């Protein structure tokens, strides 16, 4: 009973970072050495567990969270970081076990003219709690007289669309991030 890591890492359409996907991985046998010895991922930094001993442990529940961010923003997918992704889209706790997989996907998510399919939350009243998502689309501050459901001057739409083009430099190129989160049902 292999764990379905092949339908988290192979999916054609990943989700946006504001509505990041989440998959329960449970009651299966997980092979993590085939992900370490893959030579495809730019980032496989692991926190709270070492990746070479990952194939021996047993976990209770395993979450696989998948989203697409910018290339200059994979440093914000880390415990205790600050940015516009870790504040408003996807916050990881400080006591975080499990780990983060990122690889370059300019081959898959870049369209000539602008791939405005992935959106990141830009404006939200407070910072996010860890492992919390905010899929609601409501207008920002209204420091003056209220927006009344209408955009414009001094009333801002929260969601900003990523623009991915194949001519962008490495840092504006889209990256596909998978965040494994561990604790027994999932063994090696």
């Amino acid at each position, epitope marked *: 009973n292999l764990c*379905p890591f*092949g*339908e988290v890492f*192979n*999916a*054609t*359409r990943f989700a946006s970072v504001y509505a990041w996907n989440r998959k329960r991985i449970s009651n299966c046998v997980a092979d993590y050495s085939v992900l370490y010895n893959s030579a495809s991922f730019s980032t496989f930094k692991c926190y709270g567990v070492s990746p070479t001993k990952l194939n021996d442990l047993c976990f209770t529940n395993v979450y696989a969270d998948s989203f697409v961010i910018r290339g200059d923003e994979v440093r914000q997918i880390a415990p205790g970081q600050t940015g516009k992704i870790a504040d408003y889209n996807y916050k990881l706790p400080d006591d975080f076990t499990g780990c983060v997989i990122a690889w370059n996907s*300019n*081959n*898959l*998510d*870049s*369209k*000539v*003219g602008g*791939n405005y*399919n992935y959106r990141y939350r830009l404006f939200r009243k407070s910072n996010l709690k860890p492992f919390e998502r905010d899929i609601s689309t409501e207008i920002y501050q209204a420091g003056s007289k209220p927006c009344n459901g209408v955009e414009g001057f001094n009333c801002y739409f929260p969601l900003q669309s990523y623009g991915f083009q*194949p001519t962008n430099g490495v840092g504006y190129q889209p990256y596909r991030v998978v965040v494994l989160s561990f604790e027994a049902t999932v063994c090696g």
Partner: antibody, heavy 119, light 106 residues
Framework: QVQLVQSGSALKRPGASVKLSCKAS????????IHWVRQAPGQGLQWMGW????????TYAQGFTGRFVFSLDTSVSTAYLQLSSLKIEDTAVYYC?????????????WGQGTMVTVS | DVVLTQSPATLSVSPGERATLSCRAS??????LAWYQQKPGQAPRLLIH???TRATGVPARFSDSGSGTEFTLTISSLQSEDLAVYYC?????????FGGGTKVEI
């Protein structure tokens, strides 16, 4: 008319190489990806892989690694395929296909197929 | 890979009755499954992209249904020009995987 025009047939010896072109006319070539599908005679369709026109990176399936190499020329708007080191069990029809969308990979416009007969 | 199984391998229906072509997927491919039509000798021809969208130039008798791991292609009234081998293709997961095909016969 939107089209994908392929080359003619082939008759090669085992160990030889054949160069199949797939020329795209009627649409902007860089905007849409090109997928290669192989169909053996009396057998189902079997995906080989794809190549990106605006990035140039080829991707291969599980079995079509090594001998099969994709390439393209952007200016004349065509895509190629190297069948290096032909073996006897490569007698098949080789299609090139066009992608409907970036995330809707349904092959809306196909080629005509090049019957690569090897013996 | 996502093994897509089509049952039956061939089906025989009279010219005018409903023909249902099942394509069962190994994993949940969502609603991302295309249906092709390879008439004998010609290139395959796309019929339905995902369960709503039909192609350009396709007759309106072809209808898709199902989502997840169970997909049926339903031809309403069979003509004499719809005798081909119908392949289902998932595109939810890389690599893109085809089915075995279903030889429709009168």
């Amino acid at each position: 008319q939107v089209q994908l025009v392929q080359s003619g047939s082939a008759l090669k010896r085992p160990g030889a190489s054949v160069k199949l072109s797939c020329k795209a006319s009627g649409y902007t070539f860089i905007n849409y990806a090109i997928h290669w599908v192989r169909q053996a005679p009396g057998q189902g369709l079997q995906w080989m892989g794809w190549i990106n026109p605006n990035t140039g990176i080829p991707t291969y399936a599980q079995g079509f690694t090594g001998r099969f190499v994709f390439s393209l020329d952007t200016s004349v708007s065509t895509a190629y395929l190297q069948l290096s080191s032909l073996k006897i069990e490569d007698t098949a029809v080789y299609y090139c296909a066009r992608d409907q969308d970036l995330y809707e990979r349904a092959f809306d416009i196909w080629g005509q197929g090049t019957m690569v007969t090897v013996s | 890979d996502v093994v897509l199984t089509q049952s039956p391998a061939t089906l025989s229906v009279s010219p005018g009755e409903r023909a249902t072509l099942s394509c069962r997927a190994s994993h949940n491919v969502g609603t991302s499954l295309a249906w092709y039509q390879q008439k004998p000798g010609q290139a395959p021809r796309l019929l339905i992209h995902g369960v709503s969208t039909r192609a350009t130039g396709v007759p309106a008798r072809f209808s898709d249904s199902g989502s997840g791991t169970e997909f049926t292609l339903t031809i309403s009234s069979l003509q004499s020009e719809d005798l081909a081998v119908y392949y289902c293709q998932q595109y939810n997961y890389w690599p893109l995987t085809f089915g075995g095909g279903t030889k429709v016969e009168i």
